[PDB]
Amino acid sequence: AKYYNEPCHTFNEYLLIPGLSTVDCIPSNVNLSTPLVKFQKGQQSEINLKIPLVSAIMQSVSGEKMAIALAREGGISFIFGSQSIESQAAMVHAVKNFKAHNELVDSQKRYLVGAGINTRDFRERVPALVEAGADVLCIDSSDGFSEWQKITIGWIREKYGDKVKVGAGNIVDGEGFRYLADAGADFIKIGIGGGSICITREQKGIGRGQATAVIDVVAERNKYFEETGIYIPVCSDGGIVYDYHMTLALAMGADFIMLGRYFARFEESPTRKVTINGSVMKEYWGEGSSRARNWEGVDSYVPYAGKLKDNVEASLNKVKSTMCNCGALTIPQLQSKAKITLVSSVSIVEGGAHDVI
Amino acid sequence: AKYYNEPCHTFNEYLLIPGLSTVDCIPSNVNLSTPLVKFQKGQQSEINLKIPLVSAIMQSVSGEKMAIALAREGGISFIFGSQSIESQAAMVHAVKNFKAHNELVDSQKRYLVGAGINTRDFRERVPALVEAGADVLCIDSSDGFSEWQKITIGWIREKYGDKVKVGAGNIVDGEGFRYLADAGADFIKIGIGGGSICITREQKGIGRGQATAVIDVVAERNKYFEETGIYIPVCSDGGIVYDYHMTLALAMGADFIMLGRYFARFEESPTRKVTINGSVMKEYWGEGSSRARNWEGVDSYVPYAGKLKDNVEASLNKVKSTMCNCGALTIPQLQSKAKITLVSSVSIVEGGAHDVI
Amino acid sequence: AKYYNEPCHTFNEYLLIPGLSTVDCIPSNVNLSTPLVKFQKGQQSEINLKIPLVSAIMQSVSGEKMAIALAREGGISFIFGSQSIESQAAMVHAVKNFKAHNELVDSQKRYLVGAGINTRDFRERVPALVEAGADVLCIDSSDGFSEWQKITIGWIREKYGDKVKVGAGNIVDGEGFRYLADAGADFIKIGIGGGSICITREQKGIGRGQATAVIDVVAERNKYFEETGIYIPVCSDGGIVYDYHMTLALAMGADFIMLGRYFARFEESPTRKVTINGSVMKEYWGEGSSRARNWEGVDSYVPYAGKLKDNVEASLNKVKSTMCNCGALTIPQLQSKAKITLVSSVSIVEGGAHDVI
Amino acid sequence: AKYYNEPCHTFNEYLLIPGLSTVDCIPSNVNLSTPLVKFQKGQQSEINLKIPLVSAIMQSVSGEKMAIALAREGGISFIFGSQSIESQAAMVHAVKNFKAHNELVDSQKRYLVGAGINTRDFRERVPALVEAGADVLCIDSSDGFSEWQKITIGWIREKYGDKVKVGAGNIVDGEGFRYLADAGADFIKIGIGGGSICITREQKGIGRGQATAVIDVVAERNKYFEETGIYIPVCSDGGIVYDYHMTLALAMGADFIMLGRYFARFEESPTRKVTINGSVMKEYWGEGSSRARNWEGVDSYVPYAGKLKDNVEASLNKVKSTMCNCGALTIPQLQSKAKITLVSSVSIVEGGAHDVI
Ligand SMILES: NC(=O)c1ncn([C@@H]2O[C@H](COP(=O)(O)O)[C@@H](O)[C@H]2O)n1
Ligand SMILES: NC(=O)c1ncn([C@@H]2O[C@H](COP(=O)(O)O)[C@@H](O)[C@H]2O)n1
Ligand SMILES: NC(=O)c1ncn([C@@H]2O[C@H](COP(=O)(O)O)[C@@H](O)[C@H]2O)n1
Ligand SMILES: NC(=O)c1ncn([C@@H]2O[C@H](COP(=O)(O)O)[C@@H](O)[C@H]2O)n1
Ligand SMILES: [K+]
Ligand SMILES: [K+]
Ligand SMILES: [K+]
Ligand SMILES: [K+]
Ligand code: NA
Ligand code: NA
Ligand code: NA
Ligand code: NA
């Protein structure tokens, strides 16, 4: 077997060390634009998010309401594919024809929307999603290091060339990244085991600390870019617990972030808002739960947070403020200048409130 | 004294990183056969289990019912030797003559069964077990790095040559492995302190993290094979808490796994099924407890799990699925291709369900 | 991004190993004097504290009463600047004209006092503080690695030359130290995230273990001194939980220590003494709490400790005793001779009371 | 300041890995004799304990009854010196004249006994203890790296030559050992902060993990022996929680072990046996508690264990059994052959009972 020199680490084990903050860096001047799909050296991506957040490919997260609400703020949603082809295409169509500052739209001013696909019924599902107006697709899987994803991407390329964009994943190391890169993926998703509703141990025991996974994949992605001139955006998927984890993921090299729990708490998520003992909650279940995969996972509740807009603004304002502490006005600048330290196992306590009531 | 460069680690500190999964790897095509006794380069073992699981040499685990139930699924039980010679031989005889898909049997279609022996009354116990029809024997001890085991194996070789198979142990490092290998053991058992009912600290303070023990012994076993052309199967004994620990043990190099608690929960274990406050439990005590060694250990209860068959199928289906994630269709292929990472002390939390009710 | 070879550590992870204690080292012979502002090689600081403790620039800590009480014992307070310019100058004036063994005073025998300033209204606030009689100033910020601090110090130098002393901060590494050193700071404050009422994670995720921060900054400060002949005193700000942490901070190289919670517990702090369920407490809130910054932080209570005098004497007696264990009669000697070890993550338990009721 | 490459570790972080156990190693053949005072290469110590245990220099542990009970089993007690010179000499006299298999006695068949002394009144206390018949003395201090101990030992040598034996300590590193070795100590005590009733953090913050301290001192002691031909026995004082910690301390190089809590639980300790809510306890307080030092520490209770004899036999039987697992028939052989591993921070759980009720 193959072993590694260091153990893997998660986002909670890292902190950012400030860099020189100049007079021109104030939160309002920070640009959070980021590429969504691959491009060549010297070019710009054909699709750029206005904010680095995308909603998870989950029944309890990315419905039509979510897709519209997020696109309005500059991000994009990936309508879940764990439903009939007709039902998914209907949601995509509804988002693209909803209009019949930071909004993410196409040349026709329609909100952009993505859709998840599987390695099984893609020959029928992909055409339907394309006709419905899907702007980008993404193969939804816990282990993207599979010949099945290569086959799926291959079929798409042979039928649509590079006109149809498709992300692939998930992978957690350089080898997995390279395999999907060579396969033709437009963006690669990183993360196995980090999800809030994913209990690795009680399952297959496959995974890797999210921080280590991102750092490793990003190194391989940068090596790949230098070798081929092709820049492939990567997505840190899962493991975001606190707002600063967003800043860390981006600083470590991720172009954008995929979140489930974070968005499930909003009014726009497709789940039911239920009031339990005085506390308004929202349902949240993983795609691996029996409650979903049958149309491996856990079913739960998340505290109601209200409308997406206000929460995203608050989260990103903190990200922007932190970026200025690090001397960065853009994500690429943050990825270049960030100083990231690991924190001791025997600590973390000093970081939070201590010795006070 | 002699010290080591790194601290020892247990199974809970590791995770598997996926490899390339090909279209031909589906759980149903995975072969879990594995060698039980030593053989020379170019040969196959005289005894191959159909599944890599064997039941512990314990009064509360391996009785005749267990031996039949496990052999039926492809594994083998080691009838406890902590009973009279006549009583143990009777159980072996009963299993071998019970018949008077994955079943593990001899050339006469009779279920295979093993039996534990001690370094004290072997001159009388071994002959009885052989006559009763025992297919394999195993010296039962917490510290197999003993001249007593060499003497026992020597007596068996001098009286039966290589016709009677005998495992030895337990050891936790290369030196212990080599000593028993040179002594003539047919397979060597690994593990001291990892058992669920073994409290190292409150005892002698001897032991080693199970993962480190397996990894070290396997390295020595492979070195031994290259030097002598002799391949000696090794058994990871104890420390299995979750199904994925099985996959890890095998990936680290163990040919098969010995479990106590896992099997004690089944209907076929020889202990009493007792109902406590609405919960059906099964008794489970270690061989070191006063309740047993007198015909150092703890006496306890384990949740009733039902029939062995359904539980083993579920566990192994998960192992097979994980093997496919790692690109392995067989155990030897898994041992060659597995990518195994240690996880941070400051983590493991991200791995399970978090920040959700 | 830039990474580090080792994770950061906090004070609780360290212990001091005794050195040779001579017959002349008794607590009463220990000198705790220390420089407050920069000077050149061969010179002495223009301001030397008689004890290495200064009170935090906080509304709930450094009022006029605190400043007088601390100066009387040899330390200095930094009157909070989170109030009107007129109100702050009034407190400074009151301390300087209060008289109208270890007392810290000027050439006119008046108690010394400091005052915090911000990078916004300094053109008006600084002149007022100078006229009021402020002996030293200090820019109050969580991230001192800013062009704003360079501008502020520059304005002060251009208007007052080196006659007005001004500390800057906070920083946590060599780069931040060097930036403020070159900018002209008279002393540099170290620490981000360590404060008792600062919850890093629930904020920006910026910071560094206090011990590592001090050690790193001190190394850079010593390198700077060797290069330029300029010695810049540094202050360890925040993270002090136990008295021995004071000894550690000083041993690691800090010239003095800034504390908030420690002083808030005293009768002289400007907060209200409230009795809760039989326990007398004192209010304590961070400068980042809404309760303060509006004239990011937490509001709380700290156990009443009584008068400052008796508590400081007790704390420093322990520091002096420990210094003698280390063979040091002065702080510089402690910084040169201290033997400091990190303690295992798997321990710390042996250090406290254990296995006894 | 001086730093170290590795953090310090405690006994709970280590486990012993078995070595070859021969047929001649059974508990009853294990010899636990060990030297108490220094000797030259090729010689034997003038005083050899029959068991490697000595009772702490504490009011709540080593009284006349304890000294007699322990000497009867082969160990020695150090009558506390935190009492009047007359009172301490009386206890020593009573033990030496009490008679007016493994018993530790002098040439006159009288039980051996030790006595603690301080660096203050030794000019009067030492003569009294010598006349009373003390067999060995030991300077009692938390930080033995002091000129005061050198002076004390010097006075003893000048007045009695090498006829009066005197141990010194405590120290935790090679430098401290060497200082006391050159000063003339007959044996050196190791340990600061490990005591069960010693709360390092709430005090001076001085100390070192006991395991690391012993290992380091032993290395220096062996280097010293090779340089001068003088072998100085060392004592591991404090930190023993479990019986196996005894085996570890000895395996790491300590010639004998000093314990407080362990002995306080016995009928022979001088404290009161009190019954609390159905549980018989014994009082136990440190020498640093106000309750003692006035004729820094904690006052507590320890579960009654009964007579010393039966408990010591049980503890040492386990030590002997473990020694045989390691292939050692004597302490020196154990120190030469022991294989000692550190255990992961993320573990230790596997070592104890787990996943069972
Ligand atoms: N285990 C499951 O049932 C399940 N369902 C979704 N997921 C993963 O978790 C991610 C969401 O993580 P989180 O809630 O944001 O921490 C998804 O984008 C996906 O990669 N896991
Ligand atoms: N300490 C005891 O009393 C005792 N009895 C059995 N054992 C060990 O524990 C193993 C079972 O571990 P577990 O229950 O499967 O974790 C046995 O195969 C044996 O090696 N230990
Ligand atoms: N986060 C806040 O609201 C806040 N207010 C003050 N502080 C920091 O905490 C320090 C006090 O730390 P402590 O209470 O002594 O641990 C201050 O000197 C300052 O650097 N932080
Ligand atoms: N801190 C105290 O008040 C005190 N009193 C005794 N001690 C130390 O603790 C040792 C006993 O440790 P323990 O109880 O056996 O863990 C003593 O031999 C001594 O070195 N410490
Ligand atoms: K900055
Ligand atoms: K795979
Ligand atoms: K000392
Ligand atoms: K052995
Ligand atoms: Na904090
Ligand atoms: Na998880
Ligand atoms: Na302690
Ligand atoms: Na165990």
Side-chain angles (χ1 to χ4, degrees):
Chain A
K2 167 185 162 53
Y3 295 100
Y4 301 74
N5 293 157
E6 298 294 325
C8 54
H9 304 282
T10 60
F11 293 136
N12 274 322
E13 302 180 64
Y14 292 94
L15 290 180
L16 286 159
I17 292 178
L20 177 57
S21 297
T22 48
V23 294
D24 68 351
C25 202
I26 54 181
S28 66
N29 289 321
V30 174
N31 168 25
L32 295 180
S33 299
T34 202
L36 185 72
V37 301
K38 67 172 177 176
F39 54 94
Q40 295 293 298
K41 172 181 179 177
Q43 314 179 325
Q44 291 301 302
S45 181
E46 293 169 63
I47 300 177
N48 293 280
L49 304 172
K50 291 187 180 179
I51 60 169
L53 309 183
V54 307
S55 56
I57 315 180
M58 304 173 65
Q59 311 180 326
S60 63
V61 179
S62 301
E64 60 273 4
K65 290 184 179 181
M66 179 62 71
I68 291 167
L70 184 46
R72 280 175 174 168
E73 303 308 309
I76 199 178
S77 290
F78 284 84
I79 304 297
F80 60 104
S82 52
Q83 63 179 312
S84 76
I85 294 177
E86 299 62 46
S87 186
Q88 177 178 34
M91 295 189 176
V92 169
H93 184 80
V95 176
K96 298 303 296 178
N97 300 75
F98 189 69
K99 297 182 177 180
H101 270 297
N102 295 299
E103 58 164 30
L104 182 59
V105 299
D106 54 35
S107 59
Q108 289 169 282
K109 299 295 295 181
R110 301 137 69 212
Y111 296 125
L112 297 188
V113 67
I117 65 173
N118 57 66
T119 57
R120 311 272 296 208
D121 61 35
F122 63 85
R123 295 183 185 73
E124 289 65 49
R125 190 181 293 280
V126 174
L129 297 178
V130 172
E131 320 301 350
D135 297 290
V136 63
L137 309 175
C138 187
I139 305 174
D140 178 24
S141 173
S142 53
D143 169 19
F145 205 166
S146 166
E147 189 174 1
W148 293 113
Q149 301 223 351
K150 177 176 182 178
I151 289 171
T152 298
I153 301 174
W155 185 88
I156 293 177
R157 289 289 172 251
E158 156 285 305
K159 203 284 180 59
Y160 301 104
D162 292 295
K163 285 72 174 186
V164 170
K165 307 304 180 179
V166 55
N170 289 18
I171 49 78
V172 292
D173 69 353
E175 293 189 61
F177 169 85
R178 188 169 286 283
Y179 183 78
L180 293 179
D182 289 335
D186 286 293
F187 77 74
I188 295 169
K189 206 139 64 59
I190 305 164
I192 295 177
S196 66
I197 35 60
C198 199
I199 306 176
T200 310
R201 284 183 167 181
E202 302 186 307
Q203 300 173 182
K204 292 182 182 178
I206 62 176
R208 194 182 202 184
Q210 191 71 193
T212 300
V214 173
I215 294 172
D216 187 39
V217 172
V218 163
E220 195 66 37
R221 183 277 298 290
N222 292 338
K223 183 173 187 172
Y224 194 81
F225 174 67
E226 297 294 345
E227 312 179 327
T228 69
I230 304 168
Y231 184 85
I232 301 179
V234 297
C235 170
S236 181
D237 177 20
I240 301 296
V241 182
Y242 301 124
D243 290 324
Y244 84 98
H245 287 349
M246 294 179 189
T247 313
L248 284 173
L250 296 170
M252 291 172 179
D255 300 274
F256 52 103
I257 305 162
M258 177 172 281
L259 307 83
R261 182 192 62 66
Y262 180 84
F263 288 112
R265 302 169 308 150
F266 306 145
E267 175 64 47
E268 298 92 336
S269 66
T271 64
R272 295 190 310 155
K273 189 195 303 179
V274 299
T275 304
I276 303 177
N277 59 60
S279 290
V280 183
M281 314 293 274
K282 293 223 66 175
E283 326 181 80
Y284 181 57
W285 63 88
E287 288 294 296
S289 69
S290 57
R291 177 177 180 179
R293 68 169 184 288
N294 194 196
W295 90 76
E296 301 181 298
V298 295
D299 192 8
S300 60
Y301 293 108
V302 297
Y304 179 59
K307 306 290 291 183
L308 177 158
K309 188 181 183 305
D310 303 305
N311 286 280
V312 169
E313 186 181 69
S315 291
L316 297 187
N317 279 328
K318 291 172 62 180
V319 172
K320 292 175 185 175
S321 188
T322 302
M323 284 173 68
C324 278
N325 286 123
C326 301
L329 282 178
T330 69
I331 290 174
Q333 179 164 45
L334 170 72
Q335 301 176 325
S336 174
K337 306 172 69 173
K339 298 154 71 182
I340 309 172
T341 186
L342 192 63
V343 312
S344 68
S345 174
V346 211
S347 182
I348 291 178
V349 181
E350 187 183 75
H354 58 287
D355 302 291
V356 296
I357 302 180
Chain B
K2 167 185 162 53
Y3 295 100
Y4 301 74
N5 293 157
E6 298 294 325
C8 54
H9 304 282
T10 60
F11 293 136
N12 274 321
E13 302 180 64
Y14 292 94
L15 290 180
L16 286 159
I17 292 178
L20 177 57
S21 297
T22 48
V23 294
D24 68 351
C25 202
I26 54 181
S28 66
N29 289 321
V30 174
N31 168 25
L32 295 180
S33 299
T34 202
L36 185 72
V37 301
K38 67 172 177 176
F39 54 94
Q40 295 293 298
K41 172 181 179 177
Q43 314 179 325
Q44 291 301 302
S45 181
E46 293 169 63
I47 300 177
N48 293 280
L49 304 172
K50 291 187 180 179
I51 60 169
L53 309 183
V54 307
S55 56
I57 315 180
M58 304 173 65
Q59 311 180 326
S60 63
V61 179
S62 301
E64 60 273 4
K65 290 184 179 181
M66 179 62 71
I68 291 167
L70 184 46
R72 280 175 174 168
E73 303 308 309
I76 199 178
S77 290
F78 284 84
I79 304 297
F80 60 104
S82 52
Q83 63 179 312
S84 76
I85 294 177
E86 299 62 46
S87 186
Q88 177 178 34
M91 295 189 176
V92 169
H93 184 80
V95 176
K96 298 303 296 178
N97 300 75
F98 189 69
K99 297 182 177 180
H101 270 297
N102 295 299
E103 58 164 30
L104 182 59
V105 299
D106 54 35
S107 59
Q108 289 169 282
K109 299 295 295 181
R110 301 137 69 212
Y111 296 125
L112 297 188
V113 67
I117 65 173
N118 57 66
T119 57
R120 311 272 296 208
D121 61 35
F122 63 85
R123 295 183 185 73
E124 289 65 49
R125 190 181 293 280
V126 174
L129 297 178
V130 172
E131 320 301 350
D135 297 290
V136 63
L137 309 175
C138 187
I139 305 174
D140 178 24
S141 173
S142 53
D143 169 19
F145 205 166
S146 166
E147 189 174 1
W148 293 113
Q149 301 223 351
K150 177 176 182 178
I151 289 171
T152 298
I153 301 174
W155 185 88
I156 293 177
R157 289 289 172 251
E158 156 285 305
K159 203 284 180 59
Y160 301 104
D162 292 295
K163 285 72 174 186
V164 170
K165 307 304 180 179
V166 55
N170 289 18
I171 49 78
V172 292
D173 69 353
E175 293 189 61
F177 169 85
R178 188 169 286 283
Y179 183 78
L180 293 179
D182 289 335
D186 286 293
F187 77 74
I188 295 169
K189 206 139 64 59
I190 305 164
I192 295 177
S196 66
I197 35 60
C198 199
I199 306 176
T200 310
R201 284 183 167 181
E202 302 186 307
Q203 300 173 182
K204 292 182 182 178
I206 62 176
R208 194 182 202 184
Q210 191 71 193
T212 300
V214 173
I215 294 172
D216 187 39
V217 172
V218 163
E220 195 66 37
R221 183 277 298 290
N222 292 338
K223 183 173 187 172
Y224 194 81
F225 174 67
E226 297 294 345
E227 312 179 327
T228 69
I230 304 168
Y231 184 85
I232 301 179
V234 297
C235 170
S236 181
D237 177 20
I240 301 296
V241 182
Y242 301 124
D243 290 324
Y244 84 98
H245 287 349
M246 294 179 189
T247 313
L248 284 173
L250 296 170
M252 291 172 179
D255 300 274
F256 52 103
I257 305 162
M258 177 172 281
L259 307 83
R261 182 192 62 66
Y262 180 84
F263 288 112
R265 302 169 308 150
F266 306 145
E267 175 64 47
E268 298 92 336
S269 66
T271 64
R272 295 190 310 155
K273 189 195 303 179
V274 299
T275 304
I276 303 177
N277 59 60
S279 290
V280 183
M281 314 293 274
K282 293 223 66 175
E283 326 181 80
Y284 181 57
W285 63 88
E287 288 294 296
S289 69
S290 57
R291 177 177 180 179
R293 68 169 184 288
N294 194 196
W295 90 76
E296 301 181 298
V298 295
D299 192 8
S300 60
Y301 293 108
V302 297
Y304 179 59
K307 306 290 291 183
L308 177 158
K309 188 181 183 305
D310 303 305
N311 286 280
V312 169
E313 186 181 69
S315 291
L316 297 187
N317 279 328
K318 291 172 62 180
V319 172
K320 292 175 185 175
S321 188
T322 302
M323 284 173 68
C324 278
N325 286 123
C326 301
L329 282 178
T330 69
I331 290 174
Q333 179 164 45
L334 170 72
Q335 301 176 325
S336 174
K337 306 172 69 173
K339 298 154 71 182
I340 309 172
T341 186
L342 192 63
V343 312
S344 68
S345 174
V346 211
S347 182
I348 291 178
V349 181
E350 187 183 75
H354 58 287
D355 302 291
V356 296
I357 302 180
Chain C
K2 167 185 162 53
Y3 295 100
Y4 301 74
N5 293 157
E6 298 294 325
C8 54
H9 304 282
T10 60
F11 293 136
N12 274 322
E13 302 180 64
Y14 292 94
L15 290 180
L16 286 159
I17 292 178
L20 177 57
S21 297
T22 48
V23 294
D24 68 351
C25 202
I26 54 181
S28 66
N29 289 321
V30 174
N31 168 25
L32 295 180
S33 299
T34 202
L36 185 72
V37 301
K38 67 172 177 176
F39 54 94
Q40 295 293 298
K41 172 181 179 177
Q43 314 179 325
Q44 291 301 302
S45 181
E46 293 169 63
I47 300 177
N48 293 280
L49 304 172
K50 291 187 180 179
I51 60 169
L53 309 183
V54 307
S55 56
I57 315 180
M58 304 173 65
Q59 311 180 326
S60 63
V61 179
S62 301
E64 60 273 4
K65 290 184 179 181
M66 179 62 71
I68 291 167
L70 184 46
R72 280 175 174 168
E73 303 308 309
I76 199 178
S77 290
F78 284 84
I79 304 297
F80 60 104
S82 52
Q83 63 179 312
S84 76
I85 294 177
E86 299 62 46
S87 186
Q88 177 178 34
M91 295 189 176
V92 169
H93 184 80
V95 176
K96 298 303 296 178
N97 300 75
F98 189 69
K99 297 182 177 180
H101 270 297
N102 295 299
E103 58 164 30
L104 182 59
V105 299
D106 54 35
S107 59
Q108 289 169 282
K109 299 295 295 181
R110 301 137 69 212
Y111 296 125
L112 297 188
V113 67
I117 65 173
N118 57 66
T119 57
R120 311 272 296 208
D121 61 35
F122 63 85
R123 295 183 185 73
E124 289 65 49
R125 190 181 293 280
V126 174
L129 297 178
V130 172
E131 320 301 350
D135 297 290
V136 63
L137 309 175
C138 187
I139 305 174
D140 178 24
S141 173
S142 53
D143 169 19
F145 205 166
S146 166
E147 189 174 1
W148 293 113
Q149 301 223 351
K150 177 176 182 178
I151 289 171
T152 298
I153 301 174
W155 185 88
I156 293 177
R157 289 289 172 251
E158 156 285 305
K159 203 284 180 59
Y160 301 104
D162 292 295
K163 285 72 174 186
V164 170
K165 307 304 180 179
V166 55
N170 289 18
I171 49 78
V172 292
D173 69 353
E175 293 189 61
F177 169 85
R178 188 169 286 283
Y179 183 78
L180 293 179
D182 289 335
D186 286 293
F187 77 74
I188 295 169
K189 206 139 64 59
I190 305 164
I192 295 177
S196 66
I197 35 60
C198 199
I199 306 176
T200 310
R201 284 183 167 181
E202 302 186 307
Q203 300 173 182
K204 292 182 182 178
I206 62 176
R208 194 182 202 184
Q210 191 71 193
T212 300
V214 173
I215 294 172
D216 187 39
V217 172
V218 163
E220 195 66 37
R221 183 277 298 290
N222 292 338
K223 183 173 187 172
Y224 194 81
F225 174 67
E226 297 294 345
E227 312 179 327
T228 69
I230 304 168
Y231 184 85
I232 301 179
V234 297
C235 170
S236 181
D237 177 20
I240 301 296
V241 182
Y242 301 124
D243 290 324
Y244 84 98
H245 287 349
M246 294 179 189
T247 313
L248 284 173
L250 296 170
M252 291 172 179
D255 300 274
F256 52 103
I257 305 162
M258 177 172 281
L259 307 83
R261 182 192 62 66
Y262 180 84
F263 288 112
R265 302 169 308 150
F266 306 145
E267 175 64 47
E268 298 92 336
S269 66
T271 64
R272 295 190 310 155
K273 189 195 303 179
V274 299
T275 304
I276 303 177
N277 59 60
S279 290
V280 183
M281 314 293 274
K282 293 223 66 175
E283 326 181 80
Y284 181 57
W285 63 88
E287 288 294 296
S289 69
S290 57
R291 177 177 180 179
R293 68 169 184 288
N294 194 196
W295 90 76
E296 301 181 298
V298 295
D299 192 8
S300 60
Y301 293 108
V302 297
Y304 179 59
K307 306 290 291 183
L308 177 158
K309 188 181 183 305
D310 303 305
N311 286 280
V312 169
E313 186 181 69
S315 291
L316 297 187
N317 279 328
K318 291 172 62 180
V319 172
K320 292 175 185 175
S321 188
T322 302
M323 284 173 68
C324 278
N325 286 123
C326 301
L329 282 178
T330 69
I331 290 174
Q333 179 164 45
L334 170 72
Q335 301 176 325
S336 174
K337 306 172 69 173
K339 298 154 71 182
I340 309 172
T341 186
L342 192 63
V343 312
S344 68
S345 174
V346 211
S347 182
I348 291 178
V349 181
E350 187 183 75
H354 58 287
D355 302 291
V356 296
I357 302 180
Chain D
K2 167 185 162 53
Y3 295 100
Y4 301 74
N5 293 157
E6 298 294 325
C8 54
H9 304 282
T10 60
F11 293 136
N12 274 321
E13 302 180 64
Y14 292 94
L15 290 180
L16 286 159
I17 292 178
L20 177 57
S21 297
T22 48
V23 294
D24 68 351
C25 202
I26 54 181
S28 66
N29 289 321
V30 174
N31 168 25
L32 295 180
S33 299
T34 202
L36 185 72
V37 301
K38 67 172 177 176
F39 54 94
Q40 295 293 298
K41 172 181 179 177
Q43 314 179 325
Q44 291 301 302
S45 181
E46 293 169 63
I47 300 177
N48 293 280
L49 304 172
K50 291 187 180 179
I51 60 169
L53 309 183
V54 307
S55 56
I57 315 180
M58 304 173 65
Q59 311 180 326
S60 63
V61 179
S62 301
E64 60 273 4
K65 290 184 179 181
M66 179 62 71
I68 291 167
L70 184 46
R72 280 175 174 168
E73 303 308 309
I76 199 178
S77 290
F78 284 84
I79 304 297
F80 60 104
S82 52
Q83 63 179 312
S84 76
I85 294 177
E86 299 62 46
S87 186
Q88 177 178 34
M91 295 189 176
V92 169
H93 184 80
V95 176
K96 298 303 296 178
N97 300 75
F98 189 69
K99 297 182 177 180
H101 270 297
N102 295 299
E103 58 164 30
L104 182 59
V105 299
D106 54 35
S107 59
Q108 289 169 282
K109 299 295 295 181
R110 301 137 69 212
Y111 296 125
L112 297 188
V113 67
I117 65 173
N118 57 66
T119 57
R120 311 272 296 208
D121 61 35
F122 63 85
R123 295 183 185 73
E124 289 65 49
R125 190 181 293 280
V126 174
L129 297 178
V130 172
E131 320 301 350
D135 297 290
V136 63
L137 309 175
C138 187
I139 305 174
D140 178 24
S141 173
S142 53
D143 169 19
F145 205 166
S146 166
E147 189 174 1
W148 293 113
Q149 301 223 351
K150 177 176 182 178
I151 289 171
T152 298
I153 301 174
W155 185 88
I156 293 177
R157 289 289 172 251
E158 156 285 305
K159 203 284 180 59
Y160 301 104
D162 292 295
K163 285 72 174 186
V164 170
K165 307 304 180 179
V166 55
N170 289 18
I171 49 78
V172 292
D173 69 353
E175 293 189 61
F177 169 85
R178 188 169 286 283
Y179 183 78
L180 293 179
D182 289 335
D186 286 293
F187 77 74
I188 295 169
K189 206 139 64 59
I190 305 164
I192 295 177
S196 66
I197 35 60
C198 199
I199 306 176
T200 310
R201 284 183 167 181
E202 302 186 307
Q203 300 173 182
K204 292 182 182 178
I206 62 176
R208 194 182 202 184
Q210 191 71 193
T212 300
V214 173
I215 294 172
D216 187 39
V217 172
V218 163
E220 195 66 37
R221 183 277 298 290
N222 292 338
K223 183 173 187 172
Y224 194 81
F225 174 67
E226 297 294 345
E227 312 179 327
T228 69
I230 304 168
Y231 184 85
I232 301 179
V234 297
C235 170
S236 181
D237 177 20
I240 301 296
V241 182
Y242 301 124
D243 290 324
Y244 84 98
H245 287 349
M246 294 179 189
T247 313
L248 284 173
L250 296 170
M252 291 172 179
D255 300 274
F256 52 103
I257 305 162
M258 177 172 281
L259 307 83
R261 182 192 62 66
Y262 180 84
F263 288 112
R265 302 169 308 150
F266 306 145
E267 175 64 47
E268 298 92 336
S269 66
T271 64
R272 295 190 310 155
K273 189 195 303 179
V274 299
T275 304
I276 303 177
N277 59 60
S279 290
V280 183
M281 314 293 274
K282 293 223 66 175
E283 326 181 80
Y284 181 57
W285 63 88
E287 288 294 296
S289 69
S290 57
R291 177 177 180 179
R293 68 169 184 288
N294 194 196
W295 90 76
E296 301 181 298
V298 295
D299 192 8
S300 60
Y301 293 108
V302 297
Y304 179 59
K307 306 290 291 183
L308 177 158
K309 188 181 183 305
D310 303 305
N311 286 280
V312 169
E313 186 181 69
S315 291
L316 297 187
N317 279 328
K318 291 172 62 180
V319 172
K320 292 175 185 175
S321 188
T322 302
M323 284 173 68
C324 278
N325 286 123
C326 301
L329 282 178
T330 69
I331 290 174
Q333 179 164 45
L334 170 72
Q335 301 176 325
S336 174
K337 306 172 69 173
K339 298 154 71 182
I340 309 172
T341 186
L342 192 63
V343 312
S344 68
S345 174
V346 211
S347 182
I348 291 178
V349 181
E350 187 183 75
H354 58 287
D355 302 291
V356 296
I357 302 180

